[PDB]
Amino acid sequence: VGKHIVPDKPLSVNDELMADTVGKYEALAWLSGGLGFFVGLGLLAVLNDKASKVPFTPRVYPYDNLRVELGGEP
Amino acid sequence: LEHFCECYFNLSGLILCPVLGSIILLFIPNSRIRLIRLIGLCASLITFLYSLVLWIQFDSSTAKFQFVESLRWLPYENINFYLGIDGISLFFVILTTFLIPICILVGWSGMRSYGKEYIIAFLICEFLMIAVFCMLDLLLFYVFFESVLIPMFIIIGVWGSRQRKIKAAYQFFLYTLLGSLFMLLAILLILFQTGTTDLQILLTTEFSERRQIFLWIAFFASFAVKVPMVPVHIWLPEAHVEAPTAGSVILAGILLKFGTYGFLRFSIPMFPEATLCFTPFIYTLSAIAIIYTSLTTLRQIDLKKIIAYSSVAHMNLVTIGMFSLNIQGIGGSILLMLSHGLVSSALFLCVGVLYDRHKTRLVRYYGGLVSTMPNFSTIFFFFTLANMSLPGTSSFIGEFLILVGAFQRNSLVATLAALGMILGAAYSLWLYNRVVSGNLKPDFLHKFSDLNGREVFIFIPFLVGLVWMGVYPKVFLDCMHTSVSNLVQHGKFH
Amino acid sequence: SRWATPGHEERPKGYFMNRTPPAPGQSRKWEDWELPCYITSFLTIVILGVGLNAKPDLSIETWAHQKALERLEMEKLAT
Amino acid sequence: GDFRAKVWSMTGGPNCRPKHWRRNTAIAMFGVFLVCIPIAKLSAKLEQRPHMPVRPIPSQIWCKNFGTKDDYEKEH
Amino acid sequence: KKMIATQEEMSAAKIALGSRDMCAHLLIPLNKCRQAEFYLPWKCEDERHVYEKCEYELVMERMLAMKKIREEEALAKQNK
Amino acid sequence: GFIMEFAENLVLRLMENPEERDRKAREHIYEMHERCKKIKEMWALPIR
Amino acid sequence: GGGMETNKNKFIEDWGSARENLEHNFRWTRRNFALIGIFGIALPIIVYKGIVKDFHMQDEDAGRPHRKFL
Amino acid sequence: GRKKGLPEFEESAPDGFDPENPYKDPVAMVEMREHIVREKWIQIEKAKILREKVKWCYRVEGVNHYQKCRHLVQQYLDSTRGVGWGKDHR
Numbered sequence A: 001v002g003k004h005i006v007p008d009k010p011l012s013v014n015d016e017l018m019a020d021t022v023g024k025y026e027a028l029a030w031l032s033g034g035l036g037f038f039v040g041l042g043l044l045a046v047l048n049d050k051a052s053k054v055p056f057t058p059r060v061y062p063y064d065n066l067r068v069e070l071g072g073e074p
Numbered sequence B: 001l002e003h004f005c006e007c008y009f010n011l012s013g014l015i016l017c018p019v020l021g022s023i024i025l026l027f028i029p030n031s032r033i034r035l036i037r038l039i040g041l042c043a044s045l046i047t048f049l050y051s052l053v054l055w056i057q058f059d060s061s062t063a064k065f066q067f068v069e070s071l072r073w074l075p076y077e078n079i080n081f082y083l084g085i086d087g088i089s090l091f092f093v094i095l096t097t098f099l100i101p102i103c104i105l106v107g108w109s110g111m112r113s114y115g116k117e118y119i120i121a122f123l124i125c126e127f128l129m130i131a132v133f134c135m136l137d138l139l140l141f142y143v144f145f146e147s148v149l150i151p152m153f154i155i156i157g158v159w160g161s162r163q164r165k166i167k168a169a170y171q172f173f174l175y176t177l178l179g180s181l182f183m184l185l186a187i188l189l190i191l192f193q194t195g196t197t198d199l200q201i202l203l204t205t206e207f208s209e210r211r212q213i214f215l216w217i218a219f220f221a222s223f224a225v226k227v228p229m230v231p232v233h234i235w236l237p238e239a240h241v242e243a244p245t246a247g248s249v250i251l252a253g254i255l256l257k258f259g260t261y262g263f264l265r266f267s268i269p270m271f272p273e274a275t276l277c278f279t280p281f282i283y284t285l286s287a288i289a290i291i292y293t294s295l296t297t298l299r300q301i302d303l304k305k306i307i308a309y310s311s312v313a314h315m316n317l318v319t320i321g322m323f324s325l326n327i328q329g330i331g332g333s334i335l336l337m338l339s340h341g342l343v344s345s346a347l348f349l350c351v352g353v354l355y356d357r358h359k360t361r362l363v364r365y366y367g368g369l370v371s372t373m374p375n376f377s378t379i380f381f382f383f384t385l386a387n388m389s390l391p392g393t394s395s396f397i398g399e400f401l402i403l404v405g406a407f408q409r410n411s412l413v414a415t416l417a418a419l420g421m422i423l424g425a426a427y428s429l430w431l432y433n434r435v436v437s438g439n440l441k442p443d444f445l446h447k448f449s450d451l452n453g454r455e456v457f458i459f460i461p462f463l464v465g466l467v468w469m470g471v472y473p474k475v476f477l478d479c480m481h482t483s484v485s486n487l488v489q490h491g492k493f494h
Numbered sequence C: 001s002r003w004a005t006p007g008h009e010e011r012p013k014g015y016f017m018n019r020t021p022p023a024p025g026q027s028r029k030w031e032d033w034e035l036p037c038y039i040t041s042f043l044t045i046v047i048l049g050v051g052l053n054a055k056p057d058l059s060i061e062t063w064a065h066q067k068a069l070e071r072l073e074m075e076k077l078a079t
Numbered sequence D: 001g002d003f004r005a006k007v008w009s010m011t012g013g014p015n016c017r018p019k020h021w022r023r024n025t026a027i028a029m030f031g032v033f034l035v036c037i038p039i040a041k042l043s044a045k046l047e048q049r050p051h052m053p054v055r056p057i058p059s060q061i062w063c064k065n066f067g068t069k070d071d072y073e074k075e076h
Numbered sequence E: 001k002k003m004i005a006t007q008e009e010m011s012a013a014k015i016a017l018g019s020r021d022m023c024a025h026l027l028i029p030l031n032k033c034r035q036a037e038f039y040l041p042w043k044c045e046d047e048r049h050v051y052e053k054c055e056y057e058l059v060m061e062r063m064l065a066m067k068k069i070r071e072e073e074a075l076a077k078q079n080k
Numbered sequence F: 001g002f003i004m005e006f007a008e009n010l011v012l013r014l015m016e017n018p019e020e021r022d023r024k025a026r027e028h029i030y031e032m033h034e035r036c037k038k039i040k041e042m043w044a045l046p047i048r
Numbered sequence G: 001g002g003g004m005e006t007n008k009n010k011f012i013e014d015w016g017s018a019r020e021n022l023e024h025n026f027r028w029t030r031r032n033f034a035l036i037g038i039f040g041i042a043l044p045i046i047v048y049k050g051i052v053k054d055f056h057m058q059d060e061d062a063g064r065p066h067r068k069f070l
Numbered sequence H: 001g002r003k004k005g006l007p008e009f010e011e012s013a014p015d016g017f018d019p020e021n022p023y024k025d026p027v028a029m030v031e032m033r034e035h036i037v038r039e040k041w042i043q044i045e046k047a048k049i050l051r052e053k054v055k056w057c058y059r060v061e062g063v064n065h066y067q068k069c070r071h072l073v074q075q076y077l078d079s080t081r082g083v084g085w086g087k088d089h090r
C-alpha cells in the first residue's frame, strides 16, 4: 500500500517465495507426540476389547435374515 | 488411380487460399499498408469459413478417410499422393484456420512496421500446416513438416523482442531438424520393405515385431522432440518465450500438436505390437515430465516462461491418454490437444497484451492490475481457470477423459497424472495473483490502459470455444468416435 | 437515504474499451478490421448453428442404438 | 479514488451510485422474470415423478409426468 | 414374539430394510400416521408409543439372552 | 420454404456419396497390393 | 513521468538475467552428482519398475503370463 | 450426395477374411476391422439400454430395489464385463 520497497541490494536466488518461537524439528517432535496420543488411545481401545463385553446378542431378522430382501437368491 | 472427390468444397482449394493471398501480397507496395492488412485478413477469414464448411459435409459414421482426393507427381504414376481427413484430423485443420486470422489481428497495430513480410510468413505457415494435417502419406508429411521450419525461423528471428531470439531460433531449428531427419530414416526403412509411402497401404501391411521395434524408435525420436517429451523439451521454453506474440500462438497452439498427431496417425496403428511393448516406457517418460516440469513451472519468474512450461505438462498428459489405447484415452487426448491449442494461445495473448504496453516479462514488476485493467483481469482469470482444468472449461473434458482411459489400463500412471491437478492449480493461481492481485507499484508502472476493441474481439471466440467444448463436447466427440474406434481396434480382430 | 435519494453518477466511470466518445452528434469511425471480422462472426454463427443442426445424425452411437434395440427385440419376443 | 473514476468495469467499480439505479433495477427484474418463463416451461416438460404424491402438490398443475416409469423393463 | 407382518405388506409399505423386524406390523400404521400428520412430534403419539414399546421388548429379550450366555462363560472358567 | 428443410437438403447435396467413397477405396488397395511389385524389379537390375 | 514502459530496476534485471544464464554455473559437484543420480536415473527407473509390475500383477490376476516389454 | 436416412452397412462379416492369416486379403482385413468396431458399438449400446432399466427400477422400487432389480442388475453387470475397449479383452 504505502510505498513498495524498491530493491537497493542484489536479490537472492530464492526471492520469489520469501512459526517464529518454536524450532523446526522441535515442532515436529511436539506434533509427533500429539499424534502418538491418538496412537496410544487406539491401542488402549484395542486392549479394552469392548466388542467382547456387548450386553445383547446380535439382532436376527426374520425370513432367513432378510435374504431375499437383501438381493439374495429367491 | 484418380481419387477425385465429388464434394464441391474440397481440400485442394483450402490449400490454395493462403497461397493466392501470399502471391498477391508479394506485389503490393509497402506504402499501401491498409490494402496489405485487409487482403491478408480477408484471405485468412475466407480460409476459416471454408474449413467450417468442410466440418458441415463431414460424415461421422465411417472409419474411412473422407474428401479423399489425389495429386499426381509423375506421369509414370508410380508415386501418386493423396489428401484426406478423418475424425482425428478435422478439428486440427479447423484450429489452424481459426488461429491464423488471430495472428494477423494481434499484430494489427504494428503492421506499419511489420510490413507484408509478417502476413506472408503467417499465410505460408498456414498453407504448410494445413497440408501437414491433410496428408495420407508419410513422405509428404515429412516434406510439409520440415518446410514450416523456414517461416517459423524467420518469424522468431525477425520479430522477436530481444537478442536472445538468436539462440532461441537456432535451437528451435536444430532440434526440430534432428528429429525430422530421424523420421526420414524411418520413412526410408519403411519404403525398403513396402515400396510405397501411402498411409492407407501401410495400415494394411504386416511388420515384424523386430522391424516394428526399430521403426517405432525412429518415429519416437521425431515425435518426442515434437511433443516435447523430456529430456528434449528444453528448446521449447526459449523458443516460445523469445518469439513474437503471434509466433508463440502458432508454436504452442499448432506446431506442438504435430508430434501427438504423428503418434496418433502413424506410430500407434502401423506398429501395434511395438506400441504395446513401449507403453510402460511412454508412461514413465510422461509422468516424469508432468511432475518435474510442473514443479519447474512453480519456480519460474517470467510470464511467458510460466505459460510455456505449462504446455510441457499438458502435452505429456496428452501422450498418456493416447497410449492408453481406448476410447476415453484417445478421445481425451484429441480433445485436450484442441483445448490446449485454444487455452495456451489465449494465455500467450494475455501476456502479449501486457508486454506490448509495459515491455517486461518479469512478474515482480506487475501487481495490482485488477484496479487499472479490470476487463483484462477478468479475461485473464477465466483463461487461468481453463488452464487449471476447472470443470465447465474445455480442458477439463480432455483431462478427465484421459485420466479415465489411463486408470482402466494402469492405476499408478493415472495416480501420477492426477498430481497435475494439484501442481497446475498451484502455479496458475500463483501467477494470476502475483500479476493481477495486490497493490500497484507506481515506481515501476504508473500508466495503464485496459483492452481496446480489437483485443476484446480477439478474446471473444476463445471464450466461446472454451465454454462450448466445456459444457457440450458432444458436437466434437460425435464426429470423432468412428475414427477413434477404428484406431483403437487396428491390429486386432477380436 | 441510500434507497430514496438517486445516485450521483450522471454518466459511468471510465469508457467502455477505453475509447473516448465521438463528438456530439457524430458516430464512431470503424477500424478497418471491424466489418470483415463481424461479418465472419455472423457467418460463423449462421453456418455452425444451421448446418450442425441440419446435418444428418450419422454417429456410430445413433446407428448402433437402433441396431441394439431391434436385436434385443428379436431375442426377447423369440424365446 | 482519483484515477478509478476513469476506469471502466462491468461491476461498476468502487462506490457505484448510478443516477437511474431504481429504473435500471426494475428493468433487470423484468428481464430476469422473462428469462425465467422459458426455464419454467422446460423444467415442467422435463420433470419425471415416478410416484404419485400422498396429497395433491403444486407440480400436478403443470407437470404431466406422474406415474409414467412403472414399466421400467421397456426403458431405453 | 412371532412375525406378524408378511413380506408383501412390508414391501408395500416401503419399510427400510433395517426396520423389517418383528415390530413392523406396528411400524406400518405408525408410518402411515406420520406421513398423514407431516411428521409432527405431538401427533401420532399412541402409534409411536406402541411401536417403541415393542422395540424396547425386542432389545430386552436380546439383553436377557446375552445375560444367560455370559453366565456359562463363567461356568466354563470355574470348571477349567 | 422452411429454413431447416432447405438446410437439410443442401447439406446432403454437399456430402460424399458413401457407396462410391467406400468403392474407390477398395480399388486403390487392390490395385496397390498387386501393383507393389513392378518398381522393385528395376531396383534389382544389375548395373553391370 | 513519461511512458507506459516499466522503469527498470537494475537489481531486478540482474536477478532475471542470472536466472536466464544458469547453465554457465553448473559444476559437476558432489551435490549435483547425487541430485542427478537420484532424480535423473534412480527415480525414473523406480517409476518404470512400478508401472511394469502393475501390468504383471494384472497379468497374474487374469491367469496370464507376464507381458514382455520394451 | 448422401440420400436421406440412417447409415446402412452389411449385417455380415466380410467373406474373404481368414482369421489364421489376416494380412492376406487387405480389403477384407479393413472391412473386418470396421465390422468388428460396429459390433462392439452394438454391445456398448446394449449395455447402455440395460443401464436405463436399472436406473428406473432403483427409482421406481425404492427400498425394494434389491429384490426387484436383481435380474436387471445381473443382466447389466454381465453385459458390462468385456464391453467396448475397457478393462476386458474380448
Ligand SMILES: CCCCCCCCCCCCCCCCCCCC(=O)O[C@H](COC(=O)CCCCCCCCCCCCCC)COP(=O)(O)OCCN
Residues within 6 Å of the ligand: B230, B231, B288, G026, G027, G028, G029, G036, G039, G040, G041
Ligand atoms: C544406468 C545408467 C544410465 C545412463 C546414465 C549415464 C551413464 C552412467 C553415469 C556415468 C558416470 C561417469 C562417472 C561419474 C563419476 C566420476 C566423477 C569424477 C569427478 C568429477 O566431478 O568429474 C566430472 C565429470 O563429470 C562427468 O563426466 C559427468 C558424468 C556423466 C553424467 C551422466 C548424466 C546422465 C543424464 C542424467 C539424467 C537426464 C534425464 C533426467 C530426466 C567433471 O568434474 P569438473 O572438475 O569438471 O567439475 C567442474 C569443476 N569446476
